[PDB]
Amino acid sequence: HRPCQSVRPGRVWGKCCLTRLCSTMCCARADCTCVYHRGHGCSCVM
Amino acid sequence: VHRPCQSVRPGRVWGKCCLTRLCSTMCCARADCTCVYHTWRGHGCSCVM
């Protein structure tokens, strides 16, 4: 349902972004989409 | 991997996810564990030690 990323080698719990993941960036809110080019980032409702 | 993403606390955009296998609430030691039901103790994992 979302990418699950490893935290430490060995740990069974990873981390995941609850809102929107834009490359490596987890957006502040769910109502954000991704922009890429500045730099990659989140575009969110004003 | 791709997994269900559980919230840890309000306001936080990063949640947690079980990289192995989830047996209801329990994240198992290994991806190859399977889920059991223990009478009086509930859902759990059974794993190759």
Residue numbers in the entry:
A (entry chain B): 3 to 39, 42 to 50
B (entry chain A): 2 to 50
Sentences from the paper on this structure:
N-terminal sequencing and subsequent cDNA cloning of this toxin revealed that each peptide chain of αD-GeXXA comprises 50 amino acid residues sharing high sequence homology with other known αD-conotoxins. Our electrophysiology data showed that αD-GeXXA has strong inhibitory activity on α9α10, α7 and α3β2 subtypes, moderate inhibitory activity on α3β4 and α1β1δε subtypes, and weak activity on α4β2 and α4β4 subtypes.
To gain insight into its biological function, we determined the crystal structure of native αD-GeXXA using ab initio methods and refined it to 1.5 Å resolution. There is one conotoxin homodimer with a pseudo two-fold symmetry per asymmetric unit. The NTD comprises an N-terminal loop and a β-strand, and the CTD assumes several extended loop conformations. However, the pseudo two-fold symmetry and the length of the dimeric full-length αD-GeXXA suggest that the two CTDs of this toxin most likely bind the two “α9α10” interfaces at the top surface of α9α10 nAChR.
